[PDB]
Amino acid sequence: DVPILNKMPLKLLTNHYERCWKYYCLPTGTSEEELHLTRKLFWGIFDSLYDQELYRMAMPCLCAIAGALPPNFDPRPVETLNVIIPEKLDSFINKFAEYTHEKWAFDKIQNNWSYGENVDEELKTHPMLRPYKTFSEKDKEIYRWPIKESLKAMIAWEWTIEKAREGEYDPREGYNPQPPDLSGVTLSRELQAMAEQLAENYHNTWGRKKKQELEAKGGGTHPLLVPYDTLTAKEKARDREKAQELLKFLQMNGYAVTRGYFLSTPAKVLGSGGHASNKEKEMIFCKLAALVRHRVSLFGTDAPLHILARSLDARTVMKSGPEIVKAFFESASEDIEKMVENLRLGKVSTTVALLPVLTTLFQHIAQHQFLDDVQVSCYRTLCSIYSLGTTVEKLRPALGECLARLAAAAFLEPQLNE
């Protein structure tokens, strides 16, 4: 429902969910990866844009929460019946469907099920536990037809599926298949995203047929009738096991199949891309939503592989965007809480910036004549130097020129920044 939100009372449900997620930090001191999908939905809420500031504060607590964890459905199913599968792939459908009966009979073997005259679940027996060879081809069609609708769903997406690489407990009564190990097959992240999108097909098609079915009965709805992006990853897993189901058998046959944590730090680099968009703002209402993302940055970094150190260099870049202001004010204070939090990014584990200190010293010459934001940036950078104490000297000699400016004379506190 949180991902369904991004009326406003569902964003308030995100606020109660945010403080309760901080109570989950107390339990902490998977489903959570789905909640990371819902954090990307929060970044979509940063894309969405006064009540917005409240729902942004609860979203800032949700950022504190996921950092502590790190320590109208409208289906549009693709065309299937339009598509025509080439005849040579149906011989492959004989293999994946024969495997479907081998695994569906073997699931029955996992609980000691056997062949019977009746569907008597007390008798520990089922009628269909007879060999896949014995099936009439129309009985094989009850297994094959969803598979054929899936291969047509891929060919409507025009995904390639083609020959390449070579293919590959006391015993139970009834037929006894020993299926090839699809579970040991591991899809590449390209093909894993392909499992994500075939699961998205199962979701939009079976979800649209489910919606029109319950409207055909005059009835209501089902829990899964929410958009596939909105789903928790555990709800996506059920369709995904059926997608990899496929795709894993496609990898085991060695067929080429194509469309034809660290990821949170990569999302932080997407937030740095939002900072590039904020430079586009700096060229001149969405930049205030970027300030919402700044509150989210101070809070998520207050809890704070190499992509993260790249995002530290991005801290130095958006610090240059502050340096444009050096020479709203509360968004800058959000950037200051984001600066101490950037010291915390220094705590997670170029020379150009020292040169900007030389500009900081010449600006100090203006002070000898007697705006101050380049001094305040220099004070937070001094706190970053205290972070260096936790762990370019000629620019320090330029700062010795600024010591000569100390000799030239509120200001003693800027001497304390030094």
Swiss-Prot record:
Tissue expression summary: Detected in skeletal muscle (at protein level). Fast- or slow-twitch skeletal muscle.
Coiled-coil regions listed in the entry: none
PTM info: The N-terminus is blocked.
Intervals holding Sequence repeats: 72-168, 169-260
Subcellular location: Sarcoplasmic reticulum membrane
Family in the record: Belongs to the ryanodine receptor (TC 1.A.3.1) family. RYR1 subfamily.
Function: Cytosolic calcium-activated calcium channel that mediates the release of Ca(2+) from the sarcoplasmic reticulum into the cytosol and thereby plays a key role in triggering muscle contraction following depolarization of T-tubules. Repeated very high-level exercise increases the open probability of the channel and leads to Ca(2+) leaking into the cytoplasm. Can also mediate the release of Ca(2+) from intracellular stores in neurons, and may thereby promote prolonged Ca(2+) signaling in the brain. Required for normal embryonic development of muscle fibers and skeletal muscle.
Other facts noted in the record for this chain: Binding of [3H]ryanodine indicates that the heterozygous channel is activated by Ca(2+) concentrations 4-fold lower than normal. Single-cell analysis of cotransfected cells shows a significantly increased resting cytoplasmic Ca(2+) level and a significantly reduced luminal Ca(2+) level.
Self-association and partners: Homotetramer. Can also form heterotetramers with RYR2. Identified in a complex composed of RYR1, PDE4D, PKA, FKBP1A and protein phosphatase 1 (PP1). Repeated very high-level exercise decreases interaction with PDE4D and protein phosphatase 1 (PP1). Interacts with CALM; CALM with bound calcium inhibits the RYR1 channel activity. Interacts with S100A1. Interacts with FKBP1A; this stabilizes the closed conformation of the channel. Interacts with CACNA1S; interaction with CACNA1S is important for activation of the RYR1 channel. Interacts with CACNB1.
Written domain comment of the UniProt record: The calcium release channel activity resides in the C-terminal region while the remaining part of the protein constitutes the 'foot' structure spanning the junctional gap between the sarcoplasmic reticulum (SR) and the T-tubule. Pore opening is mediated via the cytoplasmic calcium-binding domains that mediate a small rotation of the channel-forming transmembrane regions that then leads to channel opening.
Stated name of the protein: Ryanodine receptor 1
Originating species: Oryctolagus cuniculus
Residue numbers of the full-length protein present here: 2629 to 3212 of 5037
